Amino acid sequence: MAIPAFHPGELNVYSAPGDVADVSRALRLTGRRVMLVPTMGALHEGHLALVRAAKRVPGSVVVVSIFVNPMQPRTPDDDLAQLRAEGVEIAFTPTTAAMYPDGLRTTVQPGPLAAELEGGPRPTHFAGVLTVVLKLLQIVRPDRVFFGEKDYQQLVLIRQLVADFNLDVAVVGVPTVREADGLAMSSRNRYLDPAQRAAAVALSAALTAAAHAATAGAQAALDAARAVLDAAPGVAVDYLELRDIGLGPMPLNGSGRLLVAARLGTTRLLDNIAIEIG
Amino acid sequence: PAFHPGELNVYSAPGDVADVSRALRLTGRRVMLVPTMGALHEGHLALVRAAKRVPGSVVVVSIFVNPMQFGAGGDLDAYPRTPDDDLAQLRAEGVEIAFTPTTAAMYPDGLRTTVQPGPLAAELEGGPRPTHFAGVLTVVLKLLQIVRPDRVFFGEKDYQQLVLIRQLVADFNLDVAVVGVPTVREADGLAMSSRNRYLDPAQRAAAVALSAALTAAAHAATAGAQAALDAARAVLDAAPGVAVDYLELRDIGLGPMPLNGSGRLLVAARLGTTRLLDNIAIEIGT
Numbered sequence: 001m002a003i004p005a006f007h008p009g010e011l012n013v014y015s016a017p018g019d020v021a022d023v024s025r026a027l028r029l030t031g032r033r034v035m036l037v038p039t040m041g042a043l044h045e046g047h048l049a050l051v052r053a054a055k056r057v058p059g060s061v062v063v064v065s066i067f068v069n070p071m072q073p074r075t076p077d078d079d080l081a082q083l084r085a086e087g088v089e090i091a092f093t094p095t096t097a098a099m100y101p102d103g104l105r106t107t108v109q110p111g112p113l114a115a116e117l118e119g120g121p122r123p124t125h126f127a128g129v130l131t132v133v134l135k136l137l138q139i140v141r142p143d144r145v146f147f148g149e150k151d152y153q154q155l156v157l158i159r160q161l162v163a164d165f166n167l168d169v170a171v172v173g174v175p176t177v178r179e180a181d182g183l184a185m186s187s188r189n190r191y192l193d194p195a196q197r198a199a200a201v202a203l204s205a206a207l208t209a210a211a212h213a214a215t216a217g218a219q220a221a222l223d224a225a226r227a228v229l230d231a232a233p234g235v236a237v238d239y240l241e242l243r244d245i246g247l248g249p250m251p252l253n254g255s256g257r258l259l260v261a262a263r264l265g266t267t268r269l270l271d272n273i274a275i276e277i278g
Numbered sequence: 279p280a281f282h283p284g285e286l287n288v289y290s291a292p293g294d295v296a297d298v299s300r301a302l303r304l305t306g307r308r309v310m311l312v313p314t315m316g317a318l319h320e321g322h323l324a325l326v327r328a329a330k331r332v333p334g335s336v337v338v339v340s341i342f343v344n345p346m347q348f349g350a351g352g353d354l355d356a357y358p359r360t361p362d363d364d365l366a367q368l369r370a371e372g373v374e375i376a377f378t379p380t381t382a383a384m385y386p387d388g389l390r391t392t393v394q395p396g397p398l399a400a401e402l403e404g405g406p407r408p409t410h411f412a413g414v415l416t417v418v419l420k421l422l423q424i425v426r427p428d429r430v431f432f433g434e435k436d437y438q439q440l441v442l443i444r445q446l447v448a449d450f451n452l453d454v455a456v457v458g459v460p461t462v463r464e465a466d467g468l469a470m471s472s473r474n475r476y477l478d479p480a481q482r483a484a485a486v487a488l489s490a491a492l493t494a495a496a497h498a499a500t501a502g503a504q505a506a507l508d509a510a511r512a513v514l515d516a517a518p519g520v521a522v523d524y525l526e527l528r529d530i531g532l533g534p535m536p537l538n539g540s541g542r543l544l545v546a547a548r549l550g551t552t553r554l555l556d557n558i559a560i561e562i563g564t
């Protein structure tokens with residue numbers, strides 16, 4: 001009956017889905033606005049940008065989930081220290097068994113977008129992501145949930161989940177945090193050797209070049225991006241695609257998104273950027 | 279939108295029922311949902327009455343013939359639709375909200391993100407109908423998200439559906455209680471169904487065999503599972519023009535576990551072109 005212990009202004013850590021559900025419900029009834037930032041731990045500046053965006057909302061209480069979904073790199077104590085330093089009041093750290101007490105059973109089947117782009121090499125990846133995101137949304141019942149624009153296809157699929165299942169949450173996409181030279185933040189970046197790390201800037205350089213080339217039209221944008229990637233050694237491009245903002249076919253003019261994925265040695269990198277045609 | 283207590287308020291827009299439901303919840307009323315495909319009968323009304331019994335309840339009945347749980351072959355067009363009787367019945371029952379969405383409002387983007395049920399969906403009713411339960415679970419998930427009820431009510435008649443809905447609720451961590459309501463029957467035992475209207479007089483007479491076989495089995499079960507099944511089979515075999523599709527005795531969760539002391543016996547049979555379902559609790563031994 002009693003609500004689990006919660007101490008305002010401190011980092012409260014809960015591993016039981018029931019506990020965070022009860023605390024979240026109690027906080028909502030005290031008027032606070034529950035913000036959710038889902039992560040897979042091993043926190044970096046990208047995740048912290050999500051946290052800071054959530055904190056800006058007046059009356060916010062921020063819930064950061066840390067869960068490695070086996071269905072879709074673990075430094076527990078440093079993660080929590082970072083969150084404490086950011087003023088996060090709730091960390092939700094469940095086990096696989098807690099999230100999946102009956103094993104894999106009912107799941108989310110995404111639409112056809114999930115088979116495209118990243119879903120090429122990993123046809124079940126987004127099913128896993130949308131299943132765990134749905135569950136976190138139901139457990140926490142946040143007013144808003146924050147995702148990076150980094151994993152843009154993921155973000156679009158989440159927006160499809162929310163629309164399709166009539167979820168009441170607001171989905172907030174946060175602009176990608178980048179290193180000084182433009183490389184999109186990722187825990188994978190540290191795996192690159194110096195030659196690879198130098199070559200890796202070509203992804204962001206190609207995309208930014210395309211965004212500015214776009215005054216000259218879609219083909220000029222695509223060709224500019226390809227030219228930049230073509231100037232990099234050891235960058236195996238998996239795709240470079242200009243789509244509309246919802247990842248359907250790019251319209252003749254208007255707003256779109258340019259997405260790229262590439263392999264450097266054994267490391268796969270992704271990037272994307274807003275494009276306006278003409 | 280407006281809401282008038284003690285009267286039947288009908289909303290077609292998901293946003294209207296969502297706003298009204300949330301407002302009611304925030305003023306302390308508990309919201310009950312009874313999801314139906316219309317063509318209401320006393321079985322549906324038993325759900326409504328159970329919902330009404332919850333103190334401080336406001337009852338939302340949804341009526342939507344969900345196109346996603348039908349396959350090609352004319353079944354969708356053939357489903358009974360009795361809009362005027364349905365609403366008249368809800369008024370008579372004191373129901374305050376009817377949610378009657380359009381297909382376009384529910385599926386503005388057609389088939390996109392859906393619910394994939396677990397392996398139970400490929401058995402029994404789902405065996406020859408591979409996407410049927412995905413269709414059911416998808417619309418039920420949407421209705422639950424639109425209405426955000428405290429409790430949602432289902433009949434035990436569609437027992438497999440009920441079990442799958444409990445799976446949906448558990449697996450997606452949904453904050454709703456699922457209430458299963460025992461099957462309402464005609465005087466002779468025939469389970470209530472919107473399909474009973476498709477039995478001619480001879481078929482109606484023969485149709486008592488399903489409930490007779492199940493109830494016989496439930497009492498035969500003191501002598502074990504074989505006795506129970508064989509009693510049911512005998513009754514079905516003695517019935518003119520009953521073509522059995524399946525008769526299965528399973529664990530109560532219909533899941534990947536063997537029968538213990540508590541089981542469910544399920545039957546599906548055809549009388550002419552009309553497919554009827556029934557099921558009953560079984561206790562094995564004494």
Ligand SMILES: COc1ccc2[nH]c(C(=O)NS(=O)(=O)c3ccc(C)cn3)cc2c1
Pocket residue numbers: 038039040041045046047049050147148149150151154174175176177184185186
């Ligand atoms: C705001 O600028 C940024 C920049 C980069 C970012 N990376 C992530 C991130 O990785 N989040 S995660 O840990 O939940 C995860 C892990 C694996 C897969 C496939 C998708 N997501 C967020 C983020 C935000």
Ligand SMILES: COc1ccc2[nH]c(C(=O)NS(=O)(=O)c3ccc(C)cn3)cc2c1
Pocket residue numbers: 313314315316320321322324325432433434435436439459460461462469470471472
């Ligand atoms: C409490 O006693 C009873 C007895 C019989 C009943 N039938 C229904 C019923 O039909 N509900 S439905 O409209 O959601 C539906 C229609 C078709 C399919 C396949 C599954 N579900 C409820 C009910 C309750």
Ligand SMILES: COc1ccc2[nH]c(C(=O)NS(=O)(=O)c3ccc(C)cn3)cc2c1
Pocket residue numbers: 346347389392408409410412413416
């Ligand atoms: C031949 O036996 C099978 C076995 C499994 C199957 N899965 C699908 C399937 O999923 N199709 S879908 O993605 O277009 C879809 C999903 C959900 C809803 C409700 C309707 N359609 C078809 C199918 C056929």
